[PDB]
Amino acid sequence: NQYDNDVTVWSPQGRIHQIEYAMEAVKQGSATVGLKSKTHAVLVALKRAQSELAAHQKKILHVDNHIGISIAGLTADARLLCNFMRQECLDSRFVFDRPLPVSRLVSLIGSKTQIPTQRYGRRPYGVGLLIAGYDDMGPHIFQTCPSANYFDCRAMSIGARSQSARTYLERHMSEFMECNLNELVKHGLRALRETLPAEQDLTTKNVSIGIVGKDLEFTIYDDDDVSPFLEGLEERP
Amino acid sequence: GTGYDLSASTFSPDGRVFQVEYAMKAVENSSTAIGIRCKDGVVFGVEKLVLSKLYEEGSNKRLFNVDRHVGMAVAGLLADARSLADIAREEASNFRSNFGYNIPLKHLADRVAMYVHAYTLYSAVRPFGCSFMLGSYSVNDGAQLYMIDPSGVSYGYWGCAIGKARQAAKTEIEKLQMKEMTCRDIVKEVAKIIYIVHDEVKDKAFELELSWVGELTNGRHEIVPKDIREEAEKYAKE
Amino acid sequence: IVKMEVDYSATVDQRLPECAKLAKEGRLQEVIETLLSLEKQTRTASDMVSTSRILVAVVKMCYEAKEWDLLNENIMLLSKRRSQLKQAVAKMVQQCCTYVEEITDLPIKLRLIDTLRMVTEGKIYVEIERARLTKTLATI
Amino acid sequence: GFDRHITIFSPEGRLYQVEYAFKAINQGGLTSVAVRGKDCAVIVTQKKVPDKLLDSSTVTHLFKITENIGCVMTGMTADSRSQVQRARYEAANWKYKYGYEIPVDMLCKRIADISQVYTQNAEMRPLGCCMILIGIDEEQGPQVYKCDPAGYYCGFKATAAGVKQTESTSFLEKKVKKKFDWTFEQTVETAITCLSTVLSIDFKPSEIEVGVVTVENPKFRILTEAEIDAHLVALAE
Amino acid sequence: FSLTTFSPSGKLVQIEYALAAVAGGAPSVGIKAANGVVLATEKKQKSILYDERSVHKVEPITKHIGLVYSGMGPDYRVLVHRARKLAQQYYLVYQEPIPTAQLVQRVASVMQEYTQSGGVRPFGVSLLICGWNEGRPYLFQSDPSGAYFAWKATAMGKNYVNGKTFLEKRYNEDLELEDAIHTAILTLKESFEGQMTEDNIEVGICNEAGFRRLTPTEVKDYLAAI
Amino acid sequence: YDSRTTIFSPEGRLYQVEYAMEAIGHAGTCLGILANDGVLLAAERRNIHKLLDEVFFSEKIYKLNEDMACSVAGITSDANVLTNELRLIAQRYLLQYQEPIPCEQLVTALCDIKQAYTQFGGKRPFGVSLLYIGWDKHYGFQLYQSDPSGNYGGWKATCIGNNSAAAVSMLKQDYKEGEMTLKSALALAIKVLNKTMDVSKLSAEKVEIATLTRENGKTVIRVLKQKEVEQLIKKHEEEEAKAEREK
């Protein structure tokens, strides 16, 4: 279609096509949800497994004691973004000894990812980021698309078949501020479980939880740590 | 078309740059905006599509604060818009560091327009897909308002609109009698014009981001207090 | 031709008859100049009826005060200032046509040729040509 | 192929890119007239202002490059402003490197050299804006020059640029062939009547902006509404 | 790529298109006489709006090096500026040789930045160089891609073929005095369409005393009695 | 099929380089013949338009060093820069070692630069092939031929011109090593140049020849001027007349 070949070129109908293709990178990825509360931010990621022998890969990456991210999509240029965010947060610690506020970090990520969308020979960072952080204004959940247009969200999910999780979160987002930690984690687990087909179900080995709170630094819970949250699942596949 | 609208460095057979002619289409497709120079200040206003209720209170706001007294209301591709806002902030900071005091709005608009023209001149880089208004007020220079197209140049505007429905907004803007109306009623009227522009006829519910600058704020471009301007939104609804 | 911007119908109504009284015998030219400024304001406001009334009043003042020479350069200035409004000048020639035919006099031949020179600058088929035909017949 | 797509020599032995840029100057819907006189040089261009929401105070196409040189721009406004900024930088740099003020011919030569560099290479593109610059020069009288997107800097006495530039140049050729020098009333009136005959609107004294540089009075006077109105009244008399 | 390029099997297609472009339409004849060299060209300005004392076709690169050119004048300006810088650099390095004709060959050789580093798009101007600081005159031509040719009489215009034919038939010869400028003007006359005048024709002469661009007075004087 | 210079072929050939080297055969004509106590170069002057002055004093033959000289046969634009680089390399070696550069080392450096030009980057191959004649302390008189492919060869009687095949065949037919001397080398060079140039009775102006000889502890590279060249032509003409009439 000629106009869809390169990122720099502009389509006659309006927006360019390469970035629109870039948003399909996050679409073709394992689902992940992230929701806010009054005091906590929780990420529920689907650890997609290659085979039963191999592990379920790694999601919900660690950035700092108060910030944790969940990737979705092209994993190659995603550890790069994780390194960039870690470096910026550590630079903030080194310069003025305070946790880098999540909004400023997300703005930095957007500015950094905007340049490849305009420089020839540089592909956009086709990675969807679900950043969970606890700045001084309570928990925060941010979604970063490869279009470098971030969003703030009470509860957002990205990945394959994530629309069902989005609908469930929207229908249940009213009762999100006033929820206990376990209650919110179970809300997220129900949201993620509704994404996969009925054959699949939540297991301790294929799920990951990232929780950050006022007194709780960011922690990545898995199978043994997930089991207390996985109890009381109310399984309706 | 065909081989001429591929890079900005390729001139058309008639002598046109089709890359910018297509970048303007993104601004034409994105949501609209409005900025009115009141008698003693400039009042902004932008409607923003809440594409999903999953989002929190108004985020990725089309309004930005590029300097202490200067604000930017942008429309189009929002990521490059934020990058250009960062560029404008850096330019204002550099000017304040070098020449002191506060950057005049005309010079800031000229410099950012020259930077945008530099980005649309070459071939490797692509023209910015955003159009924005720069509004500021000072006691010495009164109130100014400059609007920059994705490839054009800053122009002095008593009242301007950009985005999805430019002509529809501009008709009622020219209907409104500026240059003698205080910024309060101008806030009310920009909210009224935005609600006159279609919001839910074919889209979702829209939020009203309105900005302020003027002697009533002694410069210091800030977002209008939304709690007390909800009643202005109510008057606009009526 | 062009859309009206600012009407001065109230201004001309309240002032033109007062100006006529102030210059009943036409000894004052400041009255002529101030209506020239007023019709210039309406001309820049693109109003035709106000300009036409001003021109009709100006020539009517010259008729009653019988300044034949001052009429000649006055109508020359009016028709050559910026060409004004084609409706207004076409009107002004028409009442000039109606007036030159009632007073025999010696220099009406000069009045006839003066208006002929004002209309022969062009705009014959457009904006009244029967006046020029009548003037030429009047000269005959 | 790509002979007509990039700045490369055509098989027929031509350069099509600059040939397209020259027509790009015609694109935009504007015209300008430059007339050199016995002692002064005046430039006038129409001020096409759509709707009054614009600020007629700053919609101008004529600028002061230095204290004695003034330009008028024809073509795309962004490239016009960029070239005006470049010309101002060149004038300032010349005054810094060389004590005396930059001659208008030398400034035109430098701008044309920059434009020739632009039409050289292939990474960049020529700027679609034609600049006519005037200024008083000692031992030379008034001086008028034109720099084009190609790099050919020339033009004198009477020179015009814009959409209907050919008709204006023809009328000015007729006027200059009529052997009579124009004083500082006849030069302005000649320019005004040229631009009026090109575009017959009778030129209400608000839609044109004239720049004047005389010998007894230096500097680029951007004549106000009163001056242009007085000149128009004197001409239409 | 970023140099002189586009050379297929056995051809220099881009260079050939540059040579088609420099065919131009400005004859710019050059004659190497015994006493010196004459470079005469045609300034046929469009209409009378343009000026002839404002822009020049003949440029003195240094004290006794004069330069005339062909199509693509804007390229020629940059080329002559580069030539002036190169000659000045040579004179600064080898201080005070009064280098013109022991430099004319050298400056023609250093016209390798002229084309051997083309700059993506090669230059579209062919230039004739004259110098006489050796006790003997010199006439050299540099084309959009080649190098020095060391001409004795040539033309580089639209009718350069018939101009060169006229030059050889009129016997450019070797005993001709400095006033072979008459023959140069006659050669221009063949490739000229109009009544050539002092401002219409620009000519520079380079003799053993130096180089000088003839003012319109002498150009008209020579054009008289032709 | 051709593309950016640094490519291959489906078979595995450098068809751009091969095309350039074949194009070298087109246009230009130089030949070098090596003999004892003297090695010479013969060049064909392509354009003999009467409107030149011949002040450069050499077009094909270039003096590149005190002990060597070359002759290009490609496009002049690359030929000039290649000769400049070759002189620079020779003089750099002279500065570094305080000794004239051996001919083989100089030719290897030049062919290395040409191989680099055809190896990496989006740069055109140097479309020029040149001969070299020279003398050194180790191998004495030497002759080398380098092609744009960067693969030089140590020759003793070769041609690089348009009718290079015909010229080398004529050389092979009438070449005798050992017995060859400077005068016999001159005779053979003039004869083969007359063979490869269709117009018989070649003028001294259309042929430029240079001979390198070893004087007393010093290398002299003399280009044969017009009078000596035409005297050689006259001697060759006498030989041809005697040979033809004696049958």
Short mmCIF file of C-alpha atoms in Angstrom, two decimals, chain B residues 132-236:
data_model
loop_
_atom_site.label_atom_id
_atom_site.label_comp_id
_atom_site.label_asym_id
_atom_site.label_seq_id
_atom_site.Cartn_x
_atom_site.Cartn_y
_atom_site.Cartn_z
CA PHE B 132 -1.64 24.06 19.01
CA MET B 133 -2.45 27.49 20.40
CA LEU B 134 0.06 29.35 22.57
CA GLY B 135 -1.65 31.82 24.89
CA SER B 136 -0.09 34.17 27.42
CA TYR B 137 -0.75 37.47 29.16
CA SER B 138 1.42 40.18 30.67
CA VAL B 139 0.80 43.69 31.97
CA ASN B 140 3.29 45.16 29.50
CA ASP B 141 2.20 43.34 26.33
CA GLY B 142 -1.43 42.61 27.16
CA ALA B 143 -2.78 39.25 26.03
CA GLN B 144 -1.52 37.39 22.95
CA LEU B 145 -2.58 34.14 21.30
CA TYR B 146 -0.67 32.39 18.50
CA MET B 147 -1.76 29.23 16.69
CA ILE B 148 0.70 26.93 14.91
CA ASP B 149 -0.34 24.45 12.22
CA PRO B 150 1.51 21.12 11.82
CA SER B 151 3.61 22.82 9.12
CA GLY B 152 2.51 26.47 8.96
CA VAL B 153 3.60 29.47 11.03
CA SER B 154 2.29 31.29 14.08
CA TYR B 155 -0.45 33.84 13.42
CA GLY B 156 -1.98 36.35 15.80
CA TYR B 157 -5.52 35.29 16.69
CA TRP B 158 -8.21 37.21 18.53
CA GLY B 159 -9.98 33.84 18.70
CA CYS B 160 -9.02 30.57 17.03
CA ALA B 161 -10.17 26.98 16.72
CA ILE B 162 -8.46 23.82 15.45
CA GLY B 163 -9.27 20.12 15.25
CA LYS B 164 -12.27 18.13 14.05
CA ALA B 165 -14.70 21.04 13.51
CA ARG B 166 -12.76 24.23 12.86
CA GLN B 167 -15.31 26.12 10.74
CA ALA B 168 -18.26 25.24 12.99
CA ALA B 169 -16.46 26.60 16.05
CA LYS B 170 -15.05 29.64 14.22
CA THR B 171 -18.51 30.70 13.05
CA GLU B 172 -19.77 31.10 16.62
CA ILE B 173 -16.39 32.50 17.69
CA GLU B 174 -16.77 35.32 15.16
CA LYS B 175 -20.39 35.62 16.31
CA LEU B 176 -19.06 36.25 19.83
CA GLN B 177 -17.94 39.84 20.41
CA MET B 178 -14.48 39.74 21.99
CA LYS B 179 -12.06 42.59 22.87
CA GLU B 180 -14.53 44.00 25.40
CA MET B 181 -15.66 40.92 27.38
CA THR B 182 -13.98 39.87 30.62
CA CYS B 183 -12.32 36.48 30.88
CA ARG B 184 -15.06 35.10 33.18
CA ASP B 185 -17.84 35.35 30.61
CA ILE B 186 -15.27 34.22 28.04
CA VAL B 187 -14.79 31.00 30.03
CA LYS B 188 -18.57 30.61 30.06
CA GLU B 189 -18.75 31.27 26.32
CA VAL B 190 -15.93 28.92 25.34
CA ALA B 191 -17.67 26.17 27.30
CA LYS B 192 -20.89 27.14 25.50
CA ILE B 193 -19.21 26.97 22.08
CA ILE B 194 -17.63 23.59 22.83
CA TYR B 195 -20.99 22.15 23.86
CA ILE B 196 -22.49 23.73 20.73
CA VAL B 197 -19.89 21.69 18.88
CA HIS B 198 -21.13 18.11 18.79
CA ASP B 199 -19.92 15.95 21.68
CA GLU B 200 -22.14 12.87 22.03
CA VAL B 201 -24.01 13.05 18.71
CA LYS B 202 -21.62 10.44 17.31
CA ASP B 203 -18.93 10.13 20.01
CA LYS B 204 -18.68 9.40 23.74
CA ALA B 205 -19.13 11.84 26.62
CA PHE B 206 -16.59 14.67 26.58
CA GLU B 207 -14.70 16.44 29.35
CA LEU B 208 -14.11 20.20 29.37
CA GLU B 209 -10.49 21.22 29.95
CA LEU B 210 -10.38 25.02 30.24
CA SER B 211 -7.29 27.16 30.84
CA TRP B 212 -6.72 30.67 32.15
CA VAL B 213 -4.24 33.51 31.77
CA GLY B 214 -4.75 37.20 32.45
CA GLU B 215 -4.49 39.99 34.97
CA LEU B 216 -7.15 38.26 37.07
CA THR B 217 -4.44 35.61 37.51
CA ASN B 218 -1.58 38.17 37.24
CA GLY B 219 -0.17 36.11 34.41
CA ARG B 220 0.58 32.66 35.80
CA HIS B 221 -1.19 30.53 33.21
CA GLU B 222 -3.11 27.91 35.19
CA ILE B 223 -6.02 25.56 34.64
CA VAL B 224 -9.28 27.20 35.70
CA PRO B 225 -10.64 25.87 39.02
CA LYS B 226 -12.84 23.06 37.76
CA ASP B 227 -14.99 22.97 40.91
CA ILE B 228 -16.09 26.59 40.40
CA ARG B 229 -16.22 26.29 36.59
CA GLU B 230 -18.58 23.32 36.71
CA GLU B 231 -21.33 25.95 36.96
CA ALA B 232 -19.90 27.54 33.81
CA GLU B 233 -20.22 24.06 32.30
CA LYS B 234 -23.83 24.03 33.54
CA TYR B 235 -24.53 27.39 31.88
CA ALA B 236 -22.97 26.01 28.70
#
